[PDB]
Amino acid sequence: KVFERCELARTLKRLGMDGYRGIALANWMCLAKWESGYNTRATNYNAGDRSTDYGIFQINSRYWCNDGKTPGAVNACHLSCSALLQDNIADAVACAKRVVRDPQGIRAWVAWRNRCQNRDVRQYVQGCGV
């Protein structure tokens, strides 16, 4: 499913993402926009290390979810990577919350550093009623 901007913003707020571990809602929106364009079925194989990024937040199979084909992988979210490709983003959100519980926080995604950090991210939630 490809979410519309404000629809996703309202959905994430309802799932408790606003201010989670100090991360404002607009940062999660900026992250989803650049990682997948708000698309839950987005997948990206990394030929370099044989891992795959899954879903709206592009969560990696080496550390977070299990896809069975990634070498030396762990499954910290205790989920099949399949769960991160559903239209209902509840599992994806639960796993993204797990990712940021680590010391790096939102910085765990390099795309956040490149396109969101130190920027005016208000635009991502403006007019959405959140």
Swiss-Prot record:
Role of this protein: Lysozymes have primarily a bacteriolytic function; those in tissues and body fluids are associated with the monocyte-macrophage system and enhance the activity of immunoagents.
Pfam families: Lys
Annotated source species: Homo sapiens
GO CC terms of this entry: azurophil granule lumen; extracellular exosome; extracellular region; extracellular space; specific granule lumen; tertiary granule lumen
Gene Ontology biological process: antimicrobial humoral response; defense response to bacterium; defense response to Gram-negative bacterium; defense response to Gram-positive bacterium; inflammatory response; killing of cells of another organism
Domain C-type lysozyme, residue spans: 1-130
Family of the protein in this entry: Belongs to the glycosyl hydrolase 22 family.
InterPro entries: Glyco_hydro_22, Glyco_hydro_22_CS, Glyco_hydro_22_lys, Lysozyme-like_dom_sf
Molecular function via GO: identical protein binding; lysozyme activity
Disulfide partners: C6-C128, C30-C116, C65-C81, C77-C95
Disease: Amyloidosis, hereditary systemic 5: A form of hereditary systemic amyloidosis, a disorder characterized by amyloid deposition in multiple tissues resulting in a wide clinical spectrum. AMYLD5 primarily affects the viscera, and the predominant clinical features are renal dysfunction of varying severity, and intra-abdominal bleeding. Inheritance is autosomal dominant.
EC number: 3.2.1.17
Note: Lysozyme C is capable of both hydrolysis and transglycosylation; it also shows a slight esterase activity. It acts rapidly on both peptide-substituted and unsubstituted peptidoglycan, and slowly on chitin oligosaccharides.
Protein keywords: Amyloid, Amyloidosis, Antimicrobial, Bacteriolytic enzyme, Disease variant, Disulfide bond, Glycosidase, Hydrolase, Secreted, Signal
CDD domains according to UniProt: LYZ_C
Assembly and interaction partners: Monomer.
Name used for this protein in its record: Lysozyme C
Uppermost EC category: hydrolase
Reaction catalysis annotation: Hydrolysis of (1->4)-beta-linkages between N-acetylmuramic acid and N-acetyl-D-glucosamine residues in a peptidoglycan and between N-acetyl-D-glucosamine residues in chitodextrins
Compartments, record wording: Secreted
Entry annotation: catalytic residues: E35, D53
